[PDB]
Write a protein that binds this ligand. Structure first.
Ligand SMILES: CC(=O)O[C@H]1C[C@@]2(C)[C@@H](C[C@@H](O)[C@H]3[C@@]4(C)CC[C@@H](O)[C@@H](C)[C@@H]4CC[C@@]32C)/C1=C(\CCC=C1CCCC1)C(=O)O
Ligand SMILES: Nc1nc2c(ncn2[C@@H]2O[C@H](COP(=O)(O)OP(=O)(O)O)[C@@H](O)[C@H]2O)c(=O)[nH]1
Ligand SMILES: [Mg+2]
Ligand SMILES: [Mg+2]
Ligand SMILES: [Mg+2]
Lengths: 670, 199
RNA sequence: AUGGAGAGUUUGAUCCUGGCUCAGGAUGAACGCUGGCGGCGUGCCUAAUACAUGCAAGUCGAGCGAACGGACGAGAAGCUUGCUUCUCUGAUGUUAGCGGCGGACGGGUGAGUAACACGUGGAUAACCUACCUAUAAGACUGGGAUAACUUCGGGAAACCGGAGCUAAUACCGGAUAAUAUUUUGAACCGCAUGGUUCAAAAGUGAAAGACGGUCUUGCUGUCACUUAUAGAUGGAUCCGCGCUGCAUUAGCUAGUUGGUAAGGUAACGGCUUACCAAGGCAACGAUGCAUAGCCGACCUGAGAGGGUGAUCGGCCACACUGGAACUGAGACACGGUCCAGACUCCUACGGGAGGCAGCAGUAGGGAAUCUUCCGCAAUGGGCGAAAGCCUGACGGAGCAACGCCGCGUGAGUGAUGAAGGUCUUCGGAUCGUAAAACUCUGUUAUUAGGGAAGAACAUAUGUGUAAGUAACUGUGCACAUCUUGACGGUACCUAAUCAGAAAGCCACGGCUAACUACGUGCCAGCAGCCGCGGUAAUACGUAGGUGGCAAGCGUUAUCCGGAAUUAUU
């Protein structure tokens, strides 16, 4: 009938932070407080009510291995609460999530958790916000007490102190600020006002006039700056001991935006990709929503969690999957609460819900009205950083393995699986060692496909280092009509990357013009098979300069065999060598780790091509063997405290060292 | 009508003036298409049977499925299969209207009946496929009694077959009896069509 | 007479033999490309796989007691004569409970079954049958309980246990009463057993009240009740014949075949059990193995035949797997009970609950098959005297070109053969009356009005008339009057506006309807079969043109045909 909460009262927020910062604890406390006048997290997004406002909460993982979840949640979320450990402030994964939120233009409020922990330092945490992140963040509260002494929070906007008498989170005393901390509170309020004025010109003039800022005016200025993503309010508390959670929820209501306050969304028509459609938060508009999560619930079946941007949609109706270009029957609509799931007949713009019954709808898909044909902007996820050759222990489960891989790829955009033609192995790519390990265990148990993983095999190549004239003669004339072929070919090392080059220096028709293409084909076929270790021969110039032919016996196959024999003799005489792929690796990291990165590069048998500043970090360019690049992400993260990132692409082939080439030859022989 | 293609090209293909005027065959009596002119190939027997069937079908402006169904029911009627098929084709409301002369063209009569300007026994009939029977009357809708197209067509005193008795003053025709082969067009060899549908 | 077409391919060429392939019809179809509408149908063929969630079987107060509510309307004045209690009377009603009936129907599925399972034709002198209808005789006289309810106790719950009290159309004793049962006399009759009817004795078997009328110290109307007899309905058994592959399945059988006796069942019978004998089946295919629900029908064929067993109807079988009984007229019982087993869920660990092959839906499998809809208004069913309540049967909406059928995507004049694409002997040819322009129409679409039938009714109310009564109510019937529609303001009709929204698919070497150009060059590719592609390809890819169809067109799979290629014809 009528939506229980308006667009102005709806709040979509995500909790994000470094590992173990307290995301889950904060989410649990939020749900507990919202659900009072057995909290679980299996639901992708939880719906609650706070002070007449609907709040959708998505709790995110911290590990860089699971950055896909953060990406896909920030895509559909409106605001974020960034939790910081009080003792350490901003950490590497704090930086990563902050950068993702900045890329998606999501307003954020910082929450300094773990104030009760030994070493807690609110000032240090704020300073880390300023330095590590380069963020215009200012406190809107001050903690009275640190560690076990932490007992009160001074709201600076209204200069009011709250005292917590117990860890139960109840019986909070609203009192006036103590005199000893009054001066510090006033200084903090002045700093906050200056920080907001740096973004607001009118407030800047009002403050320069020395007039007293109204509470409402200051709150409006903070809301404007936050929603513009120019200011970051910083709060403090301890979710474990129930201090500051109510204030954090109040700040969420006051400063984080609504589906109206957020910037609009742009999409493309299916038939008119160039056409641009703006999907504003309007119930009366056509229905367009983005499916951001897909899971399976053992009781209701497949759940498709989607966020509605524009329009409305009622359960028991038909929608269009524009991305797939098909029709979907929305049979049931569910919303997950702290303790139970509730069936809801309608979903309006700016709501996160779950559809039951959708088939062939994946994350990032658009669900639009049947008549409409809009397609919202999808999500771009990082490319794999680690690759492993996987293989089932029992070949009888290979089909199960393929199906499991497909399902896992559908469930997780960042996990990829592909077959390598040259080596034939199935390679799994992921965001990190932890990601791939979790996926392997999941395949072993959930799908009952036991698999073993290893370093992927590297496809090598061969080449001729020395030139030589050679002759191939194949003469089987034992009886009747026989088989004759003769060639004299000069093999020369071609310039690397130039490929195979066949030259026809035949004079006088010694080799009939009919058979020359056969000679070239024989050379190509014989070079495909390796002459030293079975790997393809490349970058060679073969000049057919002389030969013989018997008119009755000579034939295409005979000439191809002669060319192959010539190639064999040339391999004997030209000292072939083994080449290996060399990757152009670009490593970006803070300058303080440049020495470690370059040392690791040279230890990987690569060479440092150069260095150059970029933004506030450094970039190192190097060439490393693909074989030696195995497991590079883990080493890079250990060297850079998780702050380093890299890319690698094929660059060229280079000669393998003596010992490595001998080992490869021995392995291929036996 | 359902077929909206070049009736002149169809007439040129089939070697018959589907309209009956002959305008199509007057200038270029050869087949359409790039190879139309200088065409001298000879048709096989199957080709001849197909051409005869297509001649009749495009003459009466029917689709293949309905044409086949009409052929089946005509075969189920007592008598000569080809003659019965031809008389049944004539007994269609389109054919009866065209013969009465309420329109100059068969397609025009089809559009008239489709848009409902005709009434049989004083009742509307929108389906050109309607099969008229002896003892019935075809009239015109009062709101359309003074249509320019119908009045202009009635002005031209076209021949009215013996099996129809028409009064232009009232725009009222009567289907007196079933047609005969002589009354029906002689440019069609119904035996070829019978053999075509035999195989 | 109502009915029957062939073609390619073995060769240097030939005739014959012979297989292979194609042209046809069909589908619960799927896929590819495409896609306007309406009507009527059809839509898990796979996993008889497992199932969340909602619903799919109740009804009767005119059988029964008890409880909720307590109208109309009893008493004091708090001086608030409009609000007050219990000391009353207490109506229309409602319900937890006992009791009756229903739940064995309706609906789902095809696992099992090679069998009197099914079809067809018979037989039962070997049978059972609630509710329904008709006739005859009755419905008398007594009794003890127990649900409900109250109280205590035990359990998480399910539910139990103890004590106290209370009804009946619940139960029980007794009287009277049989064609029922025994015995002795008969008469007639049939098909062995026997069947029919007439006598005389012995033993024994029932029941109830409810709501009304009247002249109310006694008769009577409707429903309900018991017994006997018939009818009707439903069920059961037996038998002839028909009904599938394999012999690289030839022997099978010991309660087996028969008899005597007993038990058992509605009923005959080795149905079962004791004793006597050694029988019984089988090349006319026993036994075994494999497969299968059967049929009306459906597809195909000129026919003879061949193939199939969706939808709809009949019959059979089954209800997580296996066994068993109780209740009941009827079950060895889909949404009942008990046990065992496998599997879900709750538990306080002692114990409990459950079974979508009902309607939606979920997961899974799959090439693939629908929405967790509206309504009992029509038909039908259960209870009731009836009003009425229940009914995922059913009646209707939603989804799907899945099929068939119907109508569209314009109609007329239009040479001036416009422009442009393609080819070209550079003359021109073709797309082409096609286009443009003019004229018209509104199927259809849009907007606004009018708006069916499906509705019979039942019940209620007046009037009569038939049986019976002393009379009356009532009963049946006849004629009358108000009231009942989810679909749905849907179909359809009327008026106005615009050719404006509405054409794609395959093929063009022969079979086989339809040929040119360019690109490629035994590559890329095509192909149903013969084959096509190595530089001037009607066979590949594109283009123009053409052919066949058209909201469909092709591909694939399967069956019959062509195949006289299992030949009875
Ligand atoms: C916020 C939240 O609850 O994150 C959860 C959800 C989470 C992100 C999970 C990590 C991982 O299993 C994830 C992947 C990518 C795994 C591969 C695929 O199975 C996909 C479908 C899958 C999707 C999400 C998932 C299930 C979480 C998580 C980390 C758990 C902790 C640790 C693991 C080892 C170190 C300690 C967390 O609690 O932070
Ligand atoms: N001392 C302290 N520990 C806390 C606080 N909040 C959370 N923790 C603990 O820190 C850990 C973080 O756990 P969790 O909430 O799962 O964090 P996440 O990894 O960010 O999701 C847990 O051991 C919490 O008990 C806090 O305010 N103080
Ligand atoms: Mg967590
Ligand atoms: Mg079976
Ligand atoms: Mg039952």
């Amino acid at each position: 009938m009528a939506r229980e909460f308006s667009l102005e009262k709806t709040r979509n927020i995500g909790i994000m932070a470094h590992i173990d910062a307290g995301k889950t604890t904060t989410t649990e406390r939020i749900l507990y407080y919202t659900g009072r006048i057995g909290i679980t997290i299996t639901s992708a997004a939880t719906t609650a009510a706070w002070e007449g406002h609907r709040v959708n909460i998505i709790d995110t993982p911290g590990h860089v291995d699971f950055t896909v979840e953060v990406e896909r949640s920030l895509r559909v979320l409106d605001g974020a609460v960034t939790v910081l450990d009080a003792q350490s402030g901003v950490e590497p994964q704090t930086e990563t999530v902050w950068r993702q939120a900045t890329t998606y233009g999501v307003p954020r409020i910082v929450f300094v958790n773990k104030m009760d922990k030994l070493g807690a330092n609110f000032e240090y945490s704020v300073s880390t916000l300023h330095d590590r992140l380069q963020a215009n963040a200012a406190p809107i509260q001050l903690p009275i007490g640190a560690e076990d002494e932490f007992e009160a929070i001074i709201d600076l906007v209204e200069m009011k102190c709250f005292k917590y008498t117990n860890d139960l989170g109840t019986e909070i005393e609203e009192i006036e600020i103590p005199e000893d901390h009054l001066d510090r509170a006033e200084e903090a309020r002045a700093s906050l006002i200056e920080a907001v004025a740096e973004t607001s010109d009118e407030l800047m003039e009002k403050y320069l006039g020395d007039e007293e800022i109204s509470v409402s005016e200051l709150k409006e200025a903070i809301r404007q700056a936050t929603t513009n993503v120019e200011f970051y309010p910083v709060l403090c508390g301890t979710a474990f001991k129930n201090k500051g959670v109510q204030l954090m929820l109040d700040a969420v209501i006051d400063y984080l935006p609504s589906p109206l306050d957020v910037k609009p969304i742009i999409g493309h028509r299916a038939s008119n990709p160039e056409e641009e459609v703006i999907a504003k938060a309007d119930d009366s508009a056509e229905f367009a929503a983005l499916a951001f999560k897909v899971m399976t619930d053992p009781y209701v079946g497949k759940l498709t969690f989607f966020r509605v941007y524009s329009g409305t949609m009622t359960s028991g109706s038909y929608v269009k999957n524009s991305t797939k270009g098909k029709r979907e029957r929305v049979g049931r609509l569910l919303q997950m609460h702290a303790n139970s799931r509730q069936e809801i007949d309608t979903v309006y713009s700016g709501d996160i819900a779950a559809a039951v019954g959708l088939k062939d709808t994946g994350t990032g898909d658009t669900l639009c009205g049947e008549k409409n044909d809009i397609i919202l902007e999808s999500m771009e996820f990082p490319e794999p950083v680690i690759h492993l050759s996987v293989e089932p222990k029992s070949k009888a489960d290979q089909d199960k393995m393929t199906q499991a891989l497909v399902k896992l790829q559908e469930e997780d955009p960042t996990f990829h699986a592909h077959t390598d033609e040259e080596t034939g192995q199935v390679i799994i790519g992921g965001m990190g060692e932890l990601h791939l390990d979790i996926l392997v265990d999941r395949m072993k148990k959930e799908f009952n496909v036991e698999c073993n993983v290893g370093a992927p095999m590297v496809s090598y190549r061969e080449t001729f280092k020395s030139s030589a004239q050679v002759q191939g003669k194949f003469s089987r004339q034992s009886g009747g009509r026989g088989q004759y072929g003769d060639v004299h070919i000069e093999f020369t090392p071609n310039e690397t990357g130039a490929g195979f080059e066949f030259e026809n220096a035949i004079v006088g028709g010694v080799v009939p013009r009919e058979y020359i293409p056969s000679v070239e084909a024989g050379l190509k076929d014989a070079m495909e098979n390796g002459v030293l270790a079975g790997y393809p021969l490349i970058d060679v110039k073969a000049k057919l300069y002389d030969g013989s032919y018997h008119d009755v016996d000579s034939s295409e196959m005979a000439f191809k065999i002669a060319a192959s024999l010539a190639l064999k003799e040339a391999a004997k005489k030209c000292d072939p060598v083994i080449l290996e792929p060399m990757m152009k690796v670009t490593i970006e990291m803070p300058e303080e780790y440049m020495g470690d990165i370059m040392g690791d590069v040279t230890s990987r048998r690569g060479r440092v091509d150069g260095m150059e500043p970029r933004g506030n970090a450094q970039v190192v360019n190097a060439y490393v063997p693909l074989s030696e690049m195995f497991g590079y992400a883990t080493s890079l993260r250990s060297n850079t405290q998780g702050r380093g990132t890299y890319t690698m692409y094929f660059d060229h082939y280079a000669e393998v060292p003596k010992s490595i080439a001998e080992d490869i030859i021995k392995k291929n022989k036996g | 009508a359902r077929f909206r293609g070049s009736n002149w090209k169809k007439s040129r293909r089939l070697g018959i003036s589907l309209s009956g005027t002959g305008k199509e065959l007057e200038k270029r009596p050869y087949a359409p298409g790039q190879h139309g002119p200088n065409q001298r190939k000879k048709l096989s027997e199957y080709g001849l049977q197909l051409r005869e069937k297509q001649k009749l079908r495009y003459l009466y402006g029917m689709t293949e499925r309905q044409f086949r169904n009409t052929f089946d029911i005509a075969g189920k009627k007592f008598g000569v299969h080809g003659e019965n098929f031809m008389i049944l084709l004539a007994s269609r409301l389109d054919a009866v209207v065209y013969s009465l002369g309420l329109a100059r063209t068969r397609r025009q009569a089809r559009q008239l009946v489709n848009h409902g300007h005709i009434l049989v026994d004083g009742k509307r009939v929108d389906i050109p496929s309607y099969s008229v029977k002896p003892g019935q009357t075809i009239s015109v809708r009062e709101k359309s009694q003074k249509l320019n197209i119908i009045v202009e067509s009635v002005e031209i005193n076209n021949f009215v077959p013996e099996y129809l008795n028409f009064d232009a003053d009232s725009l009222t025709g009567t289907f007196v009896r079933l047609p005969e082969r002589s009354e029906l067009p002689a440019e069609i060899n119904e035996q070829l069509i019978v053999e075509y549908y035999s195989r």
